[PDB]
Amino acid sequence: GITRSGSELITTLKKNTDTEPKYTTAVLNPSEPGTFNQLIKEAAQYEKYRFTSLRFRYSPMSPSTTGGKVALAFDRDAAKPPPNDLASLYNIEGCVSSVPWTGFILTVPTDSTDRFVADGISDPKLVDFGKLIMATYGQGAAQLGEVRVEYTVQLKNRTGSTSAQIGDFAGVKDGPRLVSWSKTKGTAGWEHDCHFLGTGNFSLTLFYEKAPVSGLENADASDFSVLGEAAAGSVQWAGVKVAERGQGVKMVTTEEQPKGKWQALRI
Amino acid sequence: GITRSGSELITTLKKNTDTEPKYTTAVLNPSEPGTFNQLIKEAAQYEKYRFTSLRFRYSPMSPSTTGGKVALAFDRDAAKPPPNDLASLYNIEGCVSSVPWTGFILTVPTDSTDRFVADGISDPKLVDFGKLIMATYGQGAAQLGEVRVEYTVQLKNRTGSTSAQIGDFAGVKDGPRLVSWSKTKGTAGWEHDCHFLGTGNFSLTLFYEKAPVSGLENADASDFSVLGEAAAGSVQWAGVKVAERGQGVKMVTTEEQPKGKWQALRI
Amino acid sequence: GITRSGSELITTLKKNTDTEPKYTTAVLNPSEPGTFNQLIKEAAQYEKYRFTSLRFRYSPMSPSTTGGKVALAFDRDAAKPPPNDLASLYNIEGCVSSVPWTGFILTVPTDSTDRFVADGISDPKLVDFGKLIMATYGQGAAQLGEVRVEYTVQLKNRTGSTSAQIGDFAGVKDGPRLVSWSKTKGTAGWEHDCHFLGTGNFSLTLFYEKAPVSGLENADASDFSVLGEAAAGSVQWAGVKVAERGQGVKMVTTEEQPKGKWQALRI
Amino acid sequence: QKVTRLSAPVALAYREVSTQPRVSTARDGITRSGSELITTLKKNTDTEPKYTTAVLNPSEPGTFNQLIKEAAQYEKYRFTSLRFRYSPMSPSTTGGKVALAFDRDAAKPPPNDLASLYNIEGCVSSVPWTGFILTVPTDSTDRFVADGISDPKLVDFGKLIMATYGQGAAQLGEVRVEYTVQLKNRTGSTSAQIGDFAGVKDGPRLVSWSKTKGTAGWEHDCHFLGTGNFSLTLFYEKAPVSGLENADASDFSVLGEAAAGSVQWAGVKVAERGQGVKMVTTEEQPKGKWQALRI
Amino acid sequence: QKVTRLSAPVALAYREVSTQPRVSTARDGITRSGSELITTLKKNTDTEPKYTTAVLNPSEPGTFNQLIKEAAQYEKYRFTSLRFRYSPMSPSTTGGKVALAFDRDAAKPPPNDLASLYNIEGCVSSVPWTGFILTVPTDSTDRFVADGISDPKLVDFGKLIMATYGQGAAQLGEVRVEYTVQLKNRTGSTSAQIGDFAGVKDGPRLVSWSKTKGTAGWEHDCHFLGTGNFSLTLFYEKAPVSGLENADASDFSVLGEAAAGSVQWAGVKVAERGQGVKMVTTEEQPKGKWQALRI
């Protein structure tokens, strides 16, 4: 084995001037970028880990003239519906929400079993502890704060490999056949789908021919950068900054699947 | 014996922009939901307890641009009128109120006698320590904060049983004959009564025939969810979130008692 | 961590005046009521366990003027077809069947790995040891006996949540849209379906309008408590005590799906 | 001392467990120990016994459902220990006898009659309300198991037997086989057993227990070379005449069509070696396929 | 001392025998030791390796044809010893490399490229004219074998790999698996594996290695959940489209019709877990039957 130590800043939160929290539950595993954009680059050479240190701080960068709560407590079983309701939340360890005008920390009893990361799929339970959570319920106005993950890992067994990325559609079919991070589905009534399977800030770059409808729009997304036409035969580009796993972006071109090509580099 | 540890969030408080406190006194006993919605589910198999740890924190989630006090001190003798007045309050241990823009805690000298929970009634003194209290007097504006109960219990003697729930009225009489949490009284001039004997968030579901007056209204209540008609022969539903013990909800249908049926599950 | 100790009575058996056993295989996991109706109420706050003690006794309550065998031996791999045949059974540890006119016990070598309960689904192997079994082959006449599960558990990691629950049908469609434990299928020729996805003793309470056929009948079930009409517009209630996962109960009302509503609390 | 006092209880019963197994170097062999429960018996409220004769050979499931899985890697054996107990799980308010004695020559008609039975060692029947055991003088020759057929005599000692004659009512008891084997020579292979007919010819070319002859006038033949309870499963195309009928057989389980192109299944429980079952489809041999697992 | 003098002989070769097996009490387990010879390799007179990734689990014949016969009575294991040797049986007048290193995570695409390979432990490739060995740090968790399916990760360590890149001509060599296992918990059962479709539904209800999905537009699916060389044998009725085609596969052997009512057979040699093969028959699912033995 090797090791590590934290320093990440896992997405924020955004007001809630409402009476029911609302959660961003983010999943924890050596490779789940939506929780590690700088360490998901050294688990493509190993498989198994540790944790010995890991805590989340609510940095505190927003005056007191604002208030509410910012729940924040992890649940081993990193996968299952957040509740819907507080008490529900306020009953699952973690513990610790405080107001937004202060600086809090969070810590987790970490175990000691040689668990494996996901060069997939599996089962969300035998491969990673459990996701994290964060809610905040308030109404007085602000862009609360930010957090990260204090940690120290153990990456046994020497392996090495992985990726997602260039993925072309061939009029009859497509082509993702060289490392992922997104799955491209479409929803009929052509309006389409342009997705993720990984988490972090990216550099898109790509695809083309009949520059239709649109292109490169986005929805459950982080920052977008498009410096293309439309194209009806052009070229395009964007930078994402995602949120938790699987955020989506899309084009708009007809009816039934053939197109051109693309390549998605992580960055 | 078995054991436990806290994590509950016992009701809040609400402004007080007035010059005399005002209390929510909440009662403490292994089974009194209005003080335990997650542990009143493992005392249906025992009878007697402990306490070894239990404290209430005023989480603090409201800026300083607001102020006053948030009294909060327990009195063994968990039952007797709160006073009417402060000094009165400010003379009964507990001690500890502070302003609403800070984070305080509260603690209680816990004893050591094998006391019994209430599969009823009794006497409010030989079965449970005493209720808790909380006041807050201020005028500058806000929805102060929240608290819970840090604890660790001892549940001796292996028992097992309990409930309140389906309770039908038979034109001549009723029918609560399968575990409680509410007592259904009526106040003449038909306007009626739909009550509680237990404390927590619930899932109502029920009753029907001549869909009169109304139905499912509420008064000393927590959140309500009605997805019914009125019904004059219909169906209905609601979710409560109570406050301290015994909060009430009601219908409106004539004059003199016969109706239909209902069932109240705790959740 | 917390802990426990047994006292459950897992379903019986029923004659077999035939020459091939016949099994009731019941599954074991902190939450599978069809094997725990009183402890599946304190695993909605944790996730992971132990076992340190657990044995099944054939209480013995039926004279000797009756005979045969009452196989009864557990197989870690709590999931896989029972055989079809004895030898098959009589080759899988457990060991221990005896006649019905005597009092026997059964015990299991329990391990020591921090396994997780099912807030679902998963895989029946990484989440729970394995199901139990019980056969009895005889012909001399009687209602043999009963058994339970001698145990002592370990519930690490503080969590908290779960349910199945209010789930209404809207003439066009239904509505389970607020935490499960049962799936409601119907088998054409209206005779219907009223199911489970979870395990333990419950408190039903619910549903209504055209009080037809019947209602609240049951089949692969544990104790039933109905205190309703039929209803043709009424109200109803029952207490289950299940067996291993997925035991079913049903109504009887016409032909093609619309009805009224219901809510299923675990307890 | 027999004498004076005796308590024939209303009820007597035993408590047997769940034999977990034990094994040796190379030298030129492995080993084993029993724990099987070979089929029961069923009343007989009649005046002539009636036998379930079950055959013994390392691979004859109808006498070993847990050891016929480690003889697909060897060929030859031993026996050093093997006895059958009438567990005893049925009150005394029932009675008769439960003959139970083995005959090396594990193949030949049981008689028809007792004396006949009561003249062939084994010895030992007792009443159904008691617990008896049975034992066998085992030899010492390196005999071979059946990756077929052969001859029922040079490949296995002989079948076992069991009768019971009574009339007072009950589902008597159960038995197994206390044993310890020697499996020399390292081999490895087998299955059903799957055996297809190819319009021109057949195909048994992957471990036996039955030989499929036909008797002209098509009415056919569906046989055994081994002994125990089995799980058939199989064959198909022109679902004719019948299928899966049986004659010198033990319990049958058919959950098929007929099929004229279908699928089928049955469970046998044989008797002594070579009991037969059959179909009915025309005239002259081509068909479909099948597989016979022992169990 | 390396230094001075070295004799890279024209020819070097080894002489391996025929491992006869060894075994333990009850305690709660049995044991084993290796002796298998897991498929070879075949030239590569090309500049990019090329892998045969073979999967490891007590029951995956494509990695155990003699021990997948004693895991039909248990469920869980060990490993305490297991290494793969490149026997060395091909002169030096030939050369290149013969990568060979295991990766716990016995399932995931081999790369495409070396460095990729030459970065995943195992370590150890050498030339084809020498005799090398390979070893693996084995753990210590009570893992379960596959009476199916599952997930390729919670049931078995990970597949093995082997590449060889060269151009000078030959039929390199062979390897096996040095091992010693632990088979806890007494169980007992299995087969093919036989899995029939019933016009309404199917039937895999007797031990797996493949999942049979179909992709609409009938073109279909015929899969794996296990890894090793197999012996197919099976299924039938309306001999349509085709049959027994293959795609992410190892060697195929079909000796059938098509069949429109026939019979069929094939031998796979897989690659890493889950490689697929398929038929072609209409539109919407009912058919006939099949049985897949590991071998």
PDB file of N, CA, C and O in Angstrom, chain C residues 116-132:
ATOM      1  N   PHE C 116     -24.817  -5.886   6.942  1.00  0.00           N
ATOM      2  CA  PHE C 116     -25.835  -4.833   6.820  1.00  0.00           C
ATOM      3  C   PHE C 116     -27.212  -5.444   6.558  1.00  0.00           C
ATOM      4  O   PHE C 116     -27.331  -6.476   5.880  1.00  0.00           O
ATOM      5  N   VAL C 117     -28.212  -4.782   7.111  1.00  0.00           N
ATOM      6  CA  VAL C 117     -29.616  -5.172   6.929  1.00  0.00           C
ATOM      7  C   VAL C 117     -30.087  -4.570   5.605  1.00  0.00           C
ATOM      8  O   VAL C 117     -29.354  -3.816   4.948  1.00  0.00           O
ATOM      9  N   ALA C 118     -31.300  -4.891   5.219  1.00  0.00           N
ATOM     10  CA  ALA C 118     -31.817  -4.451   3.917  1.00  0.00           C
ATOM     11  C   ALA C 118     -32.818  -3.293   4.006  1.00  0.00           C
ATOM     12  O   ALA C 118     -33.988  -3.485   4.371  1.00  0.00           O
ATOM     13  N   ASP C 119     -32.329  -2.101   3.683  1.00  0.00           N
ATOM     14  CA  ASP C 119     -33.213  -0.942   3.498  1.00  0.00           C
ATOM     15  C   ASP C 119     -33.550  -1.040   2.030  1.00  0.00           C
ATOM     16  O   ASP C 119     -33.728  -0.014   1.350  1.00  0.00           O
ATOM     17  N   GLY C 120     -33.568  -2.345   1.762  1.00  0.00           N
ATOM     18  CA  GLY C 120     -33.787  -2.991   0.474  1.00  0.00           C
ATOM     19  C   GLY C 120     -33.014  -4.330   0.460  1.00  0.00           C
ATOM     20  O   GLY C 120     -32.405  -4.735   1.465  1.00  0.00           O
ATOM     21  N   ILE C 121     -33.166  -4.533  -0.631  1.00  0.00           N
ATOM     22  CA  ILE C 121     -32.612  -5.173  -1.855  1.00  0.00           C
ATOM     23  C   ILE C 121     -31.077  -5.329  -2.058  1.00  0.00           C
ATOM     24  O   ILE C 121     -30.282  -4.520  -1.540  1.00  0.00           O
ATOM     25  N   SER C 122     -30.759  -5.156  -2.047  1.00  0.00           N
ATOM     26  CA  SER C 122     -29.681  -6.046  -2.558  1.00  0.00           C
ATOM     27  C   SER C 122     -29.817  -7.417  -3.294  1.00  0.00           C
ATOM     28  O   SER C 122     -30.683  -7.611  -4.156  1.00  0.00           O
ATOM     29  N   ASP C 123     -28.806  -8.180  -2.778  1.00  0.00           N
ATOM     30  CA  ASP C 123     -28.352  -9.561  -3.103  1.00  0.00           C
ATOM     31  C   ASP C 123     -28.679 -10.517  -1.937  1.00  0.00           C
ATOM     32  O   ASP C 123     -28.011 -10.504  -0.890  1.00  0.00           O
ATOM     33  N   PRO C 124     -29.533 -11.669  -1.849  1.00  0.00           N
ATOM     34  CA  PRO C 124     -29.703 -12.411  -0.603  1.00  0.00           C
ATOM     35  C   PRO C 124     -28.482 -13.192  -0.241  1.00  0.00           C
ATOM     36  O   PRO C 124     -28.528 -14.459  -0.294  1.00  0.00           O
ATOM     37  N   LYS C 125     -27.404 -12.532   0.118  1.00  0.00           N
ATOM     38  CA  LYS C 125     -26.207 -13.288   0.525  1.00  0.00           C
ATOM     39  C   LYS C 125     -25.162 -12.429   1.222  1.00  0.00           C
ATOM     40  O   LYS C 125     -24.451 -12.895   2.122  1.00  0.00           O
ATOM     41  N   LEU C 126     -25.071 -11.190   0.813  1.00  0.00           N
ATOM     42  CA  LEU C 126     -24.083 -10.271   1.389  1.00  0.00           C
ATOM     43  C   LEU C 126     -24.715  -9.429   2.505  1.00  0.00           C
ATOM     44  O   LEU C 126     -24.018  -8.693   3.218  1.00  0.00           O
ATOM     45  N   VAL C 127     -26.027  -9.566   2.641  1.00  0.00           N
ATOM     46  CA  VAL C 127     -26.808  -8.755   3.599  1.00  0.00           C
ATOM     47  C   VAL C 127     -27.344  -9.557   4.797  1.00  0.00           C
ATOM     48  O   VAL C 127     -27.642  -8.992   5.860  1.00  0.00           O
ATOM     49  N   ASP C 128     -27.472 -10.856   4.626  1.00  0.00           N
ATOM     50  CA  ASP C 128     -27.996 -11.731   5.691  1.00  0.00           C
ATOM     51  C   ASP C 128     -27.375 -13.124   5.581  1.00  0.00           C
ATOM     52  O   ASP C 128     -27.119 -13.621   4.474  1.00  0.00           O
ATOM     53  N   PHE C 129     -27.144 -13.729   6.736  1.00  0.00           N
ATOM     54  CA  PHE C 129     -26.552 -15.078   6.806  1.00  0.00           C
ATOM     55  C   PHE C 129     -27.218 -15.975   5.748  1.00  0.00           C
ATOM     56  O   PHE C 129     -26.705 -16.132   4.631  1.00  0.00           O
ATOM     57  N   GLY C 130     -28.360 -16.542   6.121  1.00  0.00           N
ATOM     58  CA  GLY C 130     -29.164 -17.427   5.229  1.00  0.00           C
ATOM     59  C   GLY C 130     -30.519 -17.742   5.890  1.00  0.00           C
ATOM     60  O   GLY C 130     -30.692 -17.562   7.105  1.00  0.00           O
ATOM     61  N   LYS C 131     -31.510 -18.208   5.095  1.00  0.00           N
ATOM     62  CA  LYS C 131     -32.838 -18.550   5.691  1.00  0.00           C
ATOM     63  C   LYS C 131     -32.738 -19.822   6.489  1.00  0.00           C
ATOM     64  O   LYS C 131     -31.759 -20.574   6.373  1.00  0.00           O
ATOM     65  N   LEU C 132     -33.770 -19.973   7.261  1.00  0.00           N
ATOM     66  CA  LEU C 132     -33.982 -21.143   8.076  1.00  0.00           C
ATOM     67  C   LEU C 132     -34.879 -22.072   7.272  1.00  0.00           C
ATOM     68  O   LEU C 132     -35.391 -21.697   6.206  1.00  0.00           O
TER      69      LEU C 132
END
